[PDB]
Design a protein around this ligand. Structure first.
Ligand SMILES: O=C(CO)[C@@H](O)[C@@H](O)COP(=O)(O)O
Ligand SMILES: O=C(CO)[C@H](O)[C@H](O)COP(=O)(O)O
Ligand SMILES: [Mg+2]
Ligand SMILES: [Mg+2]
Lengths: 213, 215
């Protein structure tokens, strides 16, 4: 089944713990959001893995360069997975992946914004096995919806051999759009954190995934 | 004008960064809180460095990929002067960061590490972005990628489009003559200053060479 990842896009640890104390056991993957990486630094990764060592912890660093340095900082802090942003030089993805392998972790290419199918082939040739197909939250705020071109692009990525994570303002009602595609992970940030009942929000995601897959 | 000098603080902890700033704060124009220090320490690095050096321009090299308003506000509330947005970001990300920047009388640069297009550059100018960082990837540099003809051509084209151009990416003193005759706004040096036997003298050599090459 597709896994459920909660994005902790909080500015401080104590704000993040407001969410994790409700739903840590309701999800599969705990993401240290970019917001939290910037707010608190890599201590966020170390602290959350110590709290939830049985969960996969993703550091959503969106590394643009200095792949070896930034990945090593995240993996020394006990990250399982780290993200590299799609425009990074191929040697950045390669460097992050080499480090990831030392720690038995993995790298995902986050596909927010502008990238090309040629770059996607490069990531595959470099041994990248995961991508995050990601509607920009700012594009979302400007009225960009999920659409059929996204579905086509997700299937294409899956056919290239990537495990695909889907993200970007996902609500429960969006899940049927992706039906029939072997999605690796759905990310939910706001639709869990900001729900009247975060626990019900998470369980509904899992319920719906179970029905659909 | 002479190109200014920006020191990149790509340290993992504040104390490591202060080992550099206590030597060169007054030898450089812009203090960059490197991406590595943003990740190492969080946005406190911005707040703390601005408090030590309030008279200096402080740049947060956040390389914002999305959530432009949120991330830019965090940096500006920590008293940054400038923030970076990575070239691949959706145009609304750059716009959102700029909107926030104007509230704080700050500014946004687009960092041009990695893959981008000329069409994207026109969108940046149209949205009112006035600064770009022409950036050789440090990982590309480590795989042997040299400064080349195509870099001079693109920098010139960016300048002709109306951007002030910062040059960065493993910059060494001997690289500066490659850029002579182009109105570079800022040169960034990280390792070439931080890792020198004498950071003070390294910074001074950059300033001397700049004053010769652009004088
Ligand atoms: C990033 C940007 C976020 O972590 C990702 O989109 C998940 O959060 P949302 O579900 O968009 O709130
Ligand atoms: O954003 C960066 C990558 C660095 O801060 C930039 O390249 C300057 O550092 P160095 O001169 O060490 O490459
Ligand atoms: Mg995220
Ligand atoms: Mg930098």
């Amino acid at each position: 089944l597709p896994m459920l990842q909660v994005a902790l896009d909080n500015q401080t640890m104590d704000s993040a713990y407001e969410t994790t104390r409700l739903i840590a056991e309701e999800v599969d993957i705990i993401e240290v959001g970019t917001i939290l990486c910037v707010g608190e630094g890599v201590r966020a990764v170390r602290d959350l893995k110590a709290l939830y060592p049985h969960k996969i912890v993703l550091a959503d660093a969106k590394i643009a360069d200095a792949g070896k340095i930034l990945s090593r900082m995240c993996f020394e802090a006990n990250a399982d997975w780290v993200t590299v942003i799609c425009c990074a030089d191929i040697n950045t993805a390669k460097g992050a992946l080499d480090v990831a392998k030392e720690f038995n972790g993995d790298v995902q290419i986050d596909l927010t914004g502008y990238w090309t199918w040629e770059q996607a082939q490069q990531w595959r040739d470099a041994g990248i096995g995961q991508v995050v197909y990601h509607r920009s939250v700012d594009a979302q705020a400007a009225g960009v919806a999920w659409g059929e071109a996204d579905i086509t692009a997700i299937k294409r990525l899956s056919d290239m051999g990537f495990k695909v994570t889907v993200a970007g303002g996902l609500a429960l009602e969006d899940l049927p759009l992706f039906k029939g595609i072997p999605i690796h992970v759905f990310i939910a940030g706001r639709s869990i954190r900001d729900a009247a009942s975060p626990v019900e929000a998470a369980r509904q995601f899992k319920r719906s995934i179970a029905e659909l897959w």
